[PDB]
mmCIF file of C-alpha atoms and ligand atoms in Angstrom:
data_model
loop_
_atom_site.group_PDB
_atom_site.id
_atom_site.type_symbol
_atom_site.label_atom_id
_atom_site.label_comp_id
_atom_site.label_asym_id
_atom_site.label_seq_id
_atom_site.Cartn_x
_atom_site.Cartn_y
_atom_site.Cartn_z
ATOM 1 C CA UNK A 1435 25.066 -5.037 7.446
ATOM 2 C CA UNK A 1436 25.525 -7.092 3.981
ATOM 3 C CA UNK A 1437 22.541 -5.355 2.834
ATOM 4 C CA UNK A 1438 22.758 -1.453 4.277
ATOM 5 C CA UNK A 1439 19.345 -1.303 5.393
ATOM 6 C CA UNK A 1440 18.395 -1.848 8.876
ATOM 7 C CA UNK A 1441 15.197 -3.625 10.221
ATOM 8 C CA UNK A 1442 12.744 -2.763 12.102
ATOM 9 C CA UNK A 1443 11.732 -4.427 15.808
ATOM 10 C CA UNK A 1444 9.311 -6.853 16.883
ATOM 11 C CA UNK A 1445 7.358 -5.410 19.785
ATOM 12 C CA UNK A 1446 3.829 -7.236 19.448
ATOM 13 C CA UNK A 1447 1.200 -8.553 17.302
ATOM 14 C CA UNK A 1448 1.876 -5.648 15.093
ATOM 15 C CA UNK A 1449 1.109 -7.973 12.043
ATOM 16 C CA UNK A 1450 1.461 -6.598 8.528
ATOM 17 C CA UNK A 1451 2.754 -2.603 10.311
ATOM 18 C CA UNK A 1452 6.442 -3.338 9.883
ATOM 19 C CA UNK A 1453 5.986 -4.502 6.595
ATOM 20 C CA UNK A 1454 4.184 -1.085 5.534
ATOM 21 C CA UNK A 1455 6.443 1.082 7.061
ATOM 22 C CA UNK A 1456 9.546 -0.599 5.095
ATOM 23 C CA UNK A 1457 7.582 -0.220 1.935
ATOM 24 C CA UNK A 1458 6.693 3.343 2.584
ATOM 25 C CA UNK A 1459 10.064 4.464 4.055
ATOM 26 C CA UNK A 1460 11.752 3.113 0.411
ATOM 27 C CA UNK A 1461 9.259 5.268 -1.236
ATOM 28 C CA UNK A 1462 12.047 8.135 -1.801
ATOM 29 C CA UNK A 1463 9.120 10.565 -2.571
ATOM 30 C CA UNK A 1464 7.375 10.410 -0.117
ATOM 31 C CA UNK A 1465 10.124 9.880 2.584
ATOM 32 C CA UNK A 1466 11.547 13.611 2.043
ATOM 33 C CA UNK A 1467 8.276 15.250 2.075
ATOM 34 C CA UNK A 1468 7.506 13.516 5.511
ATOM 35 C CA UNK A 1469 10.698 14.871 6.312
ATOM 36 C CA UNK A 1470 9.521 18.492 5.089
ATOM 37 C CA UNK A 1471 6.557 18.519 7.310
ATOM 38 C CA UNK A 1472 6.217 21.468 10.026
ATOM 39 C CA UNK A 1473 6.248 19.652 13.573
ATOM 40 C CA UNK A 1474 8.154 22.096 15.443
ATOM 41 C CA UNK A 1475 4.726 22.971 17.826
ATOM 42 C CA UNK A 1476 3.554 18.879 17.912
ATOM 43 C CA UNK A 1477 3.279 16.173 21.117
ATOM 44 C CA UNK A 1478 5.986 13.621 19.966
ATOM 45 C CA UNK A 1479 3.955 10.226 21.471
ATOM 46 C CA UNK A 1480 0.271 12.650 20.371
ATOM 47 C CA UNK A 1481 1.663 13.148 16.837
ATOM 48 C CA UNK A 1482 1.636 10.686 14.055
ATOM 49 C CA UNK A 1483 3.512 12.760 11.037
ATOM 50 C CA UNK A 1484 6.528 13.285 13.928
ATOM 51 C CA UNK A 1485 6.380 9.632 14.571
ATOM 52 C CA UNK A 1486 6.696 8.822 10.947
ATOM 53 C CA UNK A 1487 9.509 11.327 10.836
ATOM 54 C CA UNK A 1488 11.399 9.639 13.806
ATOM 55 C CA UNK A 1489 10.911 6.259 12.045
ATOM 56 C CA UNK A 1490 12.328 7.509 8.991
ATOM 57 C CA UNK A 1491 14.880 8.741 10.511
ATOM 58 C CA UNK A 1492 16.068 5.878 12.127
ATOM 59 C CA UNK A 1493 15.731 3.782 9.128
ATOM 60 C CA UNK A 1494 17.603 5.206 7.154
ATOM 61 C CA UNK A 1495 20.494 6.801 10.057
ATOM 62 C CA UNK A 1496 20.153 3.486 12.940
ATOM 63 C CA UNK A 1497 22.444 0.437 12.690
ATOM 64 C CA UNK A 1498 20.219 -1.105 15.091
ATOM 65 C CA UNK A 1499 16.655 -2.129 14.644
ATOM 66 C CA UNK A 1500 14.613 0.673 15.128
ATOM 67 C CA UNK A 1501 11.528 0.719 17.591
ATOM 68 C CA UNK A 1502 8.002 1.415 16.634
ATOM 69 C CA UNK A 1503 6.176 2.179 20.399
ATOM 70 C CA UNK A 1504 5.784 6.266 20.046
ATOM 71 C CA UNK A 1505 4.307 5.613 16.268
ATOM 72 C CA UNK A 1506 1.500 2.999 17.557
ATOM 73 C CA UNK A 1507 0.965 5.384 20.247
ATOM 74 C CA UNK A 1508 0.755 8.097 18.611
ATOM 75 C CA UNK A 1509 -2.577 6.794 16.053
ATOM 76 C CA UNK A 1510 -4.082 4.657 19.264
ATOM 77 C CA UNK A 1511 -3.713 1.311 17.749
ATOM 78 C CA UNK A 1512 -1.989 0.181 21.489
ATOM 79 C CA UNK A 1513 -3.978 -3.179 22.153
ATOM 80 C CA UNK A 1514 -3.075 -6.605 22.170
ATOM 81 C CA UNK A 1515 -4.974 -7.305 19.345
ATOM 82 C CA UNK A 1516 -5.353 -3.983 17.994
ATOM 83 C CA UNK A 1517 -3.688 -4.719 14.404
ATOM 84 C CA UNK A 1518 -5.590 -8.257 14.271
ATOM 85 C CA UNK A 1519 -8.893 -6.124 13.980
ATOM 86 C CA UNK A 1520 -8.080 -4.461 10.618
ATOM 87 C CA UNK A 1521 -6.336 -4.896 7.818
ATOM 88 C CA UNK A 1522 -2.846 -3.128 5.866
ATOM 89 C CA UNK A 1523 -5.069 -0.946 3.843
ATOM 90 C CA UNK A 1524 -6.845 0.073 6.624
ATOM 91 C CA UNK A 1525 -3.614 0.602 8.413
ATOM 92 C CA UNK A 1526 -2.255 2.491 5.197
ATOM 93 C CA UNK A 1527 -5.426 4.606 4.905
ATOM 94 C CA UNK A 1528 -4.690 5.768 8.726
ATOM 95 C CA UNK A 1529 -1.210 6.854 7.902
ATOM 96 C CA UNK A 1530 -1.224 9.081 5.080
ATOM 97 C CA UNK A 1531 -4.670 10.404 5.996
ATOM 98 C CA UNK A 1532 -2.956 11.718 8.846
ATOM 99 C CA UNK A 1533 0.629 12.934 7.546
ATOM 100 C CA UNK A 1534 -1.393 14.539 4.043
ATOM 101 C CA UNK A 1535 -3.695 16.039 6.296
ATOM 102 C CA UNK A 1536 -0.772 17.695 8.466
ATOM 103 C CA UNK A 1537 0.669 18.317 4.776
ATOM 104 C CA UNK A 1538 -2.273 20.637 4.021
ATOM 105 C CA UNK A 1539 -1.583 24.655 4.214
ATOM 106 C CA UNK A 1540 2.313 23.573 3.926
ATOM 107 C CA UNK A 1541 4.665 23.567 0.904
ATOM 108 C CA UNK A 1542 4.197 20.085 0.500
ATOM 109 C CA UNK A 1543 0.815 20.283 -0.063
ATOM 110 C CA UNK A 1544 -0.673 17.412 -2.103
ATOM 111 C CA UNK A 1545 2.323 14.885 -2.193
ATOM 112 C CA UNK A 1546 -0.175 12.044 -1.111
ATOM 113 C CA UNK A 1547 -2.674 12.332 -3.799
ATOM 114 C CA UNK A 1548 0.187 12.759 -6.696
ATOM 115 C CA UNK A 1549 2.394 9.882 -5.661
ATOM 116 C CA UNK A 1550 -1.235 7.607 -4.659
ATOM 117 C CA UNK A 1551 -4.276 8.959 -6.079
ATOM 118 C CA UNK A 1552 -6.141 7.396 -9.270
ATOM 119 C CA UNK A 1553 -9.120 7.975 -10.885
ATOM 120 C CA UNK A 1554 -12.257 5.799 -12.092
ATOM 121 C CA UNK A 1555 -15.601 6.302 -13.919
ATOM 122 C CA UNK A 1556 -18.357 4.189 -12.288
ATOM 123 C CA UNK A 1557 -21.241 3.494 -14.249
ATOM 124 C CA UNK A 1558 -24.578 2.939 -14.290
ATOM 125 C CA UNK A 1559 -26.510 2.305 -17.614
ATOM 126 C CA UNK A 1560 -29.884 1.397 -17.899
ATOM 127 C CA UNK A 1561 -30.977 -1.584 -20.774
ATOM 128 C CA UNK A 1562 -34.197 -0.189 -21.331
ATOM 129 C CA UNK A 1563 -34.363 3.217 -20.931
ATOM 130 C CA UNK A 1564 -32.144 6.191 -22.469
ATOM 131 C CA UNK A 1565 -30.700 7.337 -18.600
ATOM 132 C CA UNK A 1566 -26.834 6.722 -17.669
ATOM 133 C CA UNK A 1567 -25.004 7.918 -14.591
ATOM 134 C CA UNK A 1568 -21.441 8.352 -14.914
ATOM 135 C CA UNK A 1569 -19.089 9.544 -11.826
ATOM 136 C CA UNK A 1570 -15.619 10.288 -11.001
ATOM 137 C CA UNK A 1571 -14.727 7.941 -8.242
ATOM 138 C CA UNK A 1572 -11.203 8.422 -6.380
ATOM 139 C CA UNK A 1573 -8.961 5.687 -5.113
ATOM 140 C CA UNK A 1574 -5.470 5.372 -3.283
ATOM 141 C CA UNK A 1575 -5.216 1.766 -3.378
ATOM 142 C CA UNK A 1576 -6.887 -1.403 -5.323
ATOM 143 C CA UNK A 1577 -8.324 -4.852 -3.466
ATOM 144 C CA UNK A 1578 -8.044 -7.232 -5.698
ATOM 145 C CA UNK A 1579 -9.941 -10.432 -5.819
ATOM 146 C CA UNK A 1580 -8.178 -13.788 -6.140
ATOM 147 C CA UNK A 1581 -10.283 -16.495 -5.426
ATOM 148 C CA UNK A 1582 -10.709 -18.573 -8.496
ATOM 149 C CA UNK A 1583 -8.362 -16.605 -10.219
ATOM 150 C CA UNK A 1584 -5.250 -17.664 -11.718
ATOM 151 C CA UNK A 1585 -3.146 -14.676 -11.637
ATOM 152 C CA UNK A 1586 -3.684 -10.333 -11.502
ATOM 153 C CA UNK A 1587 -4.406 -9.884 -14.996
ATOM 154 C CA UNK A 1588 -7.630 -11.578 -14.377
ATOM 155 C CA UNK A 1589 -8.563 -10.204 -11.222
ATOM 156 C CA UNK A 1590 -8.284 -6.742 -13.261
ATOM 157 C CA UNK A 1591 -10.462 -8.500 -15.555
ATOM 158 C CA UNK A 1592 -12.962 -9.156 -12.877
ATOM 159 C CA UNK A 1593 -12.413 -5.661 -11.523
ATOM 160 C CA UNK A 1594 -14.041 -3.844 -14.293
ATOM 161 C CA UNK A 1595 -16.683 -6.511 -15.534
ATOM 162 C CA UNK A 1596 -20.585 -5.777 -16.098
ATOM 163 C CA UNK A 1597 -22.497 -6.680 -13.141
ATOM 164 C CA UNK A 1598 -25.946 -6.793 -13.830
ATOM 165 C CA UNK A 1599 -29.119 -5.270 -11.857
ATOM 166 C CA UNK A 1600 -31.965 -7.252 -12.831
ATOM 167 C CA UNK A 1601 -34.575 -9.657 -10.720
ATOM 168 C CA UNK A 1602 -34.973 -8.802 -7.870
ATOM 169 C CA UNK A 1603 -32.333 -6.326 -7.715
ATOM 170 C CA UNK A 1604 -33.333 -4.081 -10.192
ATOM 171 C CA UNK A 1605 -32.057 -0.022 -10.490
ATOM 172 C CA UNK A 1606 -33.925 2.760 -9.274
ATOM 173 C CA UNK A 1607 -33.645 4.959 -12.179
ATOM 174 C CA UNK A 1608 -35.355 8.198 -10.266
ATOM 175 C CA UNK A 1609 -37.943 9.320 -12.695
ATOM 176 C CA UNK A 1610 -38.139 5.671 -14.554
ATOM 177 C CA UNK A 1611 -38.951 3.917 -12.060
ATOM 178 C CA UNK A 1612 -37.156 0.045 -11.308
ATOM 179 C CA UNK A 1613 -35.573 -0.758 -14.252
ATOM 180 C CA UNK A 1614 -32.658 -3.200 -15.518
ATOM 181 C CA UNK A 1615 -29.089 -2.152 -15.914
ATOM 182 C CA UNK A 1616 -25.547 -2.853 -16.166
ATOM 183 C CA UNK A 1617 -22.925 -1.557 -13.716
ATOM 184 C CA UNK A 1618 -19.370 -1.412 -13.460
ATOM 185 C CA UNK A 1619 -16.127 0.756 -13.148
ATOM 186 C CA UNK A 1620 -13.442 1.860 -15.609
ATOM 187 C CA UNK A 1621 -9.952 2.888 -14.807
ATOM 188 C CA UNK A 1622 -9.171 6.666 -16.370
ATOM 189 C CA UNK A 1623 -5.719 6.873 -14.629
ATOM 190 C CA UNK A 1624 -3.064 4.912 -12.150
ATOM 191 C CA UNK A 1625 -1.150 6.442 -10.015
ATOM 192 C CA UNK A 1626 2.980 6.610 -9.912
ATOM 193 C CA UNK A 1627 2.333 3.847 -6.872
ATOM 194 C CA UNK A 1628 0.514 1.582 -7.364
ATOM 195 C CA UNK A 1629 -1.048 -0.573 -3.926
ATOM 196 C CA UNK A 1630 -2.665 -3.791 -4.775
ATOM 197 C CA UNK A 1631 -4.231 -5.487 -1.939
ATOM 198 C CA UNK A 1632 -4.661 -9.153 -3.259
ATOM 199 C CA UNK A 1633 -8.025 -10.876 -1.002
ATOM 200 C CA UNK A 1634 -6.244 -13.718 0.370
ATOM 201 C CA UNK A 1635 -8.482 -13.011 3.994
ATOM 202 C CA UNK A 1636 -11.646 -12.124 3.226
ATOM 203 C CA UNK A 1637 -15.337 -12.558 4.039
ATOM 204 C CA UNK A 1638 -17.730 -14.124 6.096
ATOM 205 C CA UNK A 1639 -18.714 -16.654 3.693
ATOM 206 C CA UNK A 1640 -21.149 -19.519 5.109
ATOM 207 C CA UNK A 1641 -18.853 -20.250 8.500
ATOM 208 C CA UNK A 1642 -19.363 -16.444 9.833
ATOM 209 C CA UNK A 1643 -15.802 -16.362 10.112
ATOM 210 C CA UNK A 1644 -12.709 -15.271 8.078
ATOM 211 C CA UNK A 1645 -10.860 -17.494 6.428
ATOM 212 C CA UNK A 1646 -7.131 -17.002 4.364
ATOM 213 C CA UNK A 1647 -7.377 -18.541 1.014
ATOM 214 C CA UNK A 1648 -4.155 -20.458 0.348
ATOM 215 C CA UNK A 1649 -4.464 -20.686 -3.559
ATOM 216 C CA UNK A 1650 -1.881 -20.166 -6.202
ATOM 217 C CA UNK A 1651 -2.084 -16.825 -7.682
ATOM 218 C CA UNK A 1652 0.272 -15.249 -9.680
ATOM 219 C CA UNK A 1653 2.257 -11.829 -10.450
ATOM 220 C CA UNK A 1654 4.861 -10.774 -12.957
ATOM 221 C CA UNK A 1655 7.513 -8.652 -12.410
ATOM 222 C CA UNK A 1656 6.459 -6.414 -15.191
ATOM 223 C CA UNK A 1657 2.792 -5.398 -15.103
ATOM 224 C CA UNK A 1658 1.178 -3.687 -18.426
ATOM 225 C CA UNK A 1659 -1.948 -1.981 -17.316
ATOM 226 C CA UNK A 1660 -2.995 0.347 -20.828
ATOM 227 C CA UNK A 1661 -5.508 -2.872 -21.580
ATOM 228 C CA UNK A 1662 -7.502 -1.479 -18.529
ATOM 229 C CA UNK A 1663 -7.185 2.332 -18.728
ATOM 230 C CA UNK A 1664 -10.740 4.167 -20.631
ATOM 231 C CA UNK A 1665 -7.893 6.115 -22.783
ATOM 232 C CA UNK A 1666 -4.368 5.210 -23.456
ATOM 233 C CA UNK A 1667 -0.785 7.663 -23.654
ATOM 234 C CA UNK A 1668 0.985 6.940 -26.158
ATOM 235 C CA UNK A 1669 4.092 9.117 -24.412
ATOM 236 C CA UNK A 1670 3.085 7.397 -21.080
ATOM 237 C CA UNK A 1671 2.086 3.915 -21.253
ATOM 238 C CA UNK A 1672 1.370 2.250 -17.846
ATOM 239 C CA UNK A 1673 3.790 0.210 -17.613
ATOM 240 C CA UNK A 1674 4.093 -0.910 -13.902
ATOM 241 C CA UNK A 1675 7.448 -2.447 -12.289
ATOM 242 C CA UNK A 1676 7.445 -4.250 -9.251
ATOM 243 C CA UNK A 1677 8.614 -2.924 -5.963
ATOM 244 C CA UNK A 1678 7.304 -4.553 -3.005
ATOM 245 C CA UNK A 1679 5.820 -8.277 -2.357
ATOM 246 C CA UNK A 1680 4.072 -8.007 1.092
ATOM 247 C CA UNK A 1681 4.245 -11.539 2.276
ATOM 248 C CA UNK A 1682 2.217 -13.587 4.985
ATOM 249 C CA UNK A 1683 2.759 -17.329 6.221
ATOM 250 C CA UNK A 1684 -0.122 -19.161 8.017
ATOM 251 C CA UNK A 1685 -3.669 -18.991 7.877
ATOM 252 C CA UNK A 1686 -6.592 -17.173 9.003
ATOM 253 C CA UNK A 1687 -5.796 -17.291 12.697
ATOM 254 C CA UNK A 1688 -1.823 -17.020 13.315
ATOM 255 C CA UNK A 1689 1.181 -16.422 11.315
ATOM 256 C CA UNK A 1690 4.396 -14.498 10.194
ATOM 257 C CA UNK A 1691 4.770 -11.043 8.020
ATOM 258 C CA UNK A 1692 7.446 -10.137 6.378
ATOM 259 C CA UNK A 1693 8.097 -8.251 2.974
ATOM 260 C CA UNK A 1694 10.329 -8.483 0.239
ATOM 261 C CA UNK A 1695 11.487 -5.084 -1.580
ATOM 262 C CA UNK A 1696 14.108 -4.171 -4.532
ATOM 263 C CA UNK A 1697 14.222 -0.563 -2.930
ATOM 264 C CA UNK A 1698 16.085 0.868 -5.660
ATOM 265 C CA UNK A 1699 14.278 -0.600 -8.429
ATOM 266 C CA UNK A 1700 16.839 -2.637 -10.298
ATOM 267 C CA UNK A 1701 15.891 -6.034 -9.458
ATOM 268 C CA UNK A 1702 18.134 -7.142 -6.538
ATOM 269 C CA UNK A 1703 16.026 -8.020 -3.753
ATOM 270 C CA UNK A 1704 15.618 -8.142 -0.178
ATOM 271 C CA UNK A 1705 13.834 -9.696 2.894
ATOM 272 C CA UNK A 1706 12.757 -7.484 5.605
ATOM 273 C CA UNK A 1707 11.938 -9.908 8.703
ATOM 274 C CA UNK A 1708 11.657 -7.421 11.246
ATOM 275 C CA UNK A 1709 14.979 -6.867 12.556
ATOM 276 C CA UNK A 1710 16.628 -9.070 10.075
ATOM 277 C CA UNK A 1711 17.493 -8.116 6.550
ATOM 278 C CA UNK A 1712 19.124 -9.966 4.361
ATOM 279 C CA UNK A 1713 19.792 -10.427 0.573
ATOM 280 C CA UNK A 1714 17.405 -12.760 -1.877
ATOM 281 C CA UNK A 1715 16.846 -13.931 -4.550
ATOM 282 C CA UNK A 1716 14.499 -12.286 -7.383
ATOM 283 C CA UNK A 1717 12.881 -16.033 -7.740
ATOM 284 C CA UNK A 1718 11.892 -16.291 -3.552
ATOM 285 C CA UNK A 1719 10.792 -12.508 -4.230
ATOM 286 C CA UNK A 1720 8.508 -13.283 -6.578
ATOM 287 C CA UNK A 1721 7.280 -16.882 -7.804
ATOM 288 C CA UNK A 1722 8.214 -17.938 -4.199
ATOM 289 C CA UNK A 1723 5.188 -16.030 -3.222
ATOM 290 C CA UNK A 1724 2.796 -17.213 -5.869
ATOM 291 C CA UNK A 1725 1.408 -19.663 -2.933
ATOM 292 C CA UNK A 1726 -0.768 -23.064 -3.994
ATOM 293 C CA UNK A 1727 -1.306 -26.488 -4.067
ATOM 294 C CA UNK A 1728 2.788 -22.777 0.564
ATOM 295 C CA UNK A 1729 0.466 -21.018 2.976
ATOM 296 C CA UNK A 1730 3.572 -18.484 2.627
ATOM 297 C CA UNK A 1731 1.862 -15.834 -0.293
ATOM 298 C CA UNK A 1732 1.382 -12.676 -1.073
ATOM 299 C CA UNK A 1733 -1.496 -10.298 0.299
ATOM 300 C CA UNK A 1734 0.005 -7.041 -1.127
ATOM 301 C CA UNK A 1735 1.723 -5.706 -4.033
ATOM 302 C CA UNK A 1736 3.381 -2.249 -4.704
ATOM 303 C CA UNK A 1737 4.415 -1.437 -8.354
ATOM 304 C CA UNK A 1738 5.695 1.463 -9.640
ATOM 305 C CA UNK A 1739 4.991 3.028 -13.127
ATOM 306 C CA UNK A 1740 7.823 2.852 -14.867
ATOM 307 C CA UNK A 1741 7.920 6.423 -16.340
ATOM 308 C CA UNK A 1742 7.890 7.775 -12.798
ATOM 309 C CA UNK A 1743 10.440 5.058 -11.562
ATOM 310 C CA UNK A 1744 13.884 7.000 -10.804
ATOM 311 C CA UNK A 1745 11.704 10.021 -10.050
ATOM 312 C CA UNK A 1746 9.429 8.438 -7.142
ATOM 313 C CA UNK A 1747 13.008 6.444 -6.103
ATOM 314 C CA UNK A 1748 14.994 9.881 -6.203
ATOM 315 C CA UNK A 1749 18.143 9.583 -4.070
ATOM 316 C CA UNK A 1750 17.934 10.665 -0.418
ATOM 317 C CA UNK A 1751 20.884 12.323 1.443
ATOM 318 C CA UNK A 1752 21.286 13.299 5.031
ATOM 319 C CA UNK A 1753 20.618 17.002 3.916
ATOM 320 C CA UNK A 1754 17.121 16.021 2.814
ATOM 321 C CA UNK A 1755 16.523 16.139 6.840
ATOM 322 C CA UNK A 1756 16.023 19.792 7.965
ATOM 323 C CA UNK A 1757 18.446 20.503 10.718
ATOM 324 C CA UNK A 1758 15.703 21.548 13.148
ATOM 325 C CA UNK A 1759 13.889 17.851 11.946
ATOM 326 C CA UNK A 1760 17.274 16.672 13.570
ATOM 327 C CA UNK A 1761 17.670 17.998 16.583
ATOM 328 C CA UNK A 1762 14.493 17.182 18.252
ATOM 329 C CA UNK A 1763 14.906 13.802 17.428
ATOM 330 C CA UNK A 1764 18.675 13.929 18.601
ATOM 331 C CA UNK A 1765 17.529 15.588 21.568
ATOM 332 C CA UNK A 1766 14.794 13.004 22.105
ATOM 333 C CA UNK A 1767 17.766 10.301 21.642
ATOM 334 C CA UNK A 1768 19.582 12.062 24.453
ATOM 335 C CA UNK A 1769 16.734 11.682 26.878
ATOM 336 C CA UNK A 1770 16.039 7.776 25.848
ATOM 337 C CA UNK A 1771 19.518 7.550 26.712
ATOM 338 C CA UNK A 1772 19.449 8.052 30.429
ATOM 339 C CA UNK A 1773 17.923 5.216 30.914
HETATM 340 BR BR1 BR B 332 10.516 1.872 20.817
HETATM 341 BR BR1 BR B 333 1.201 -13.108 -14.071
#
């Protein structure tokens, strides 16, 4: 390998999964609580957090490209076109839904939410009348409208602009009756990891059909987000860096996936093709992807704040896999192997 990672097969219209799983398997963090989970009494093809473990495993132990068939088993997603019916958040939701909820009542209890989880106020604030509504509102990941937009600053502008309930569409203010207002979210934190879907497929919008918008759009390396947050830290500004461009070529209908990471967060890049990985450039990481006028762009971006950078990219050893982690798998291999 000129790289020292390994890829990961092609065994169907799996889409945008291989890309995901690269991007979460670099996520140090993450990748040695998955290994911490209890699994000992699970079904290895009825068990998602052991297929996640096995994965893992073989990223980061196989010199061969590792297979994916017990993991899409294992969350039901078997089908032909099963991945062409939803999309990478979707996908992502399904995931670490499952392996947080296995992490619940263990010692790694609430990894997920620290490493993902950010928090919003949405509003609602009537013109007229002295009544506002203000909620906490949770998210693990951001979709991010593009179309018309030049680059992600101004999609974040367009993420927390006033819309306005008027006309027809007035607000039912409960005791007030129908009544004009203005409604939008603010961001009170951002998470260590940052996913930004960017709404390249989208919609329904007069065809009934989705299409893939092609359009330049663009992304730094760097990503200052304190413009956006209700209330700045001054010892923590959020500062984002740049970890993973999740790439697709084609349009609405076909096309190829693959995703470009700096793993270790120091700006020397790769290209994960499924089984191939190879060495790029930071330019074909980045402003290769901005897309425009190819229909090769990104639909996904993970950044990392930088505070929590060497932290959420910790170092992982071959002792971060418990012993009894390894030898169900190794047994497992032993079985395969008669074959
Ligand atoms: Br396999
Ligand atoms: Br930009």
């Amino acid at each position: 390998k000129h790289t020292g990672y390994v890829g990961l097969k092609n065994q169907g219209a799996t889409c945008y999964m291989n890309s995901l799983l690269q991007t979460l398997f670099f996520t140090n963090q993450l990748r040695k609580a998955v290994y911490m989970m209890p699994t000992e009494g699970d079904d290895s093809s009825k068990s998602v957090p052991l297929a996640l473990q096995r994965v893992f495993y073989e990223l980061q132990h196989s010199d061969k490209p590792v297979g994916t068939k017990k993991l899409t088993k294992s969350f039901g997603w078997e089908t032909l076109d099963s991945f062409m019916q939803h999309d990478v958040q979707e996908l992502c939701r399904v995931l670490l839904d499952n392996v947080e909820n296995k992490m619940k009542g263990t010692c790694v209890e609430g990894t997920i939410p620290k490493l993902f989880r950010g928090k919003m106020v949405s509003y609602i604030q009537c013109k007229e009348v002295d009544y506002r509504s203000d909620r906490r509102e949770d998210y693990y990941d951001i979709q991010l409208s593009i179309k018309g937009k030049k680059n992600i600053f101004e999609s974040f502008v367009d993420y927390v602009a006033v819309e306005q309930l008027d006309g027809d569409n007035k607000y039912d203010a409960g005791e007030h009756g129908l009544q004009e207002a203005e409604k939008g979210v603010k961001f009170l934190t951002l998470p260590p990891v940052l996913h930004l879907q960017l709404m390249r497929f989208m919609y329904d919008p007069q065809t009934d059909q989705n299409i893939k918008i092609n359009d330049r759009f663009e992304f730094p390396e760097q990503l200052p987000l304190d413009e956006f947050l209700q209330k700045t830290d001054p010892k923590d500004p959020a500062n984002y860096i740049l970890h993973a461009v999740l790439v697709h070529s084609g349009d609405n209908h076909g096309g190829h996936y693959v995703v470009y990471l700096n793993p270790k967060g120091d700006g020397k890049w790769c290209k994960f093709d499924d089984d191939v990985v190879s060495r790029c450039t930071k330019e074909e990481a980045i402003e290769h992807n901005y897309g425009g006028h190819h229909c090769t762009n990104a639909y996904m971006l993970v950044y990392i704040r930088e505070s929590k950078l060497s932290e959420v990219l910790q170092a992982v050893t071959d002792h971060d896999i418990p012993q009894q982690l390894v030898e169900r798998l190794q047994e497992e291999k032993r079985i395969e192997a008669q074959k």
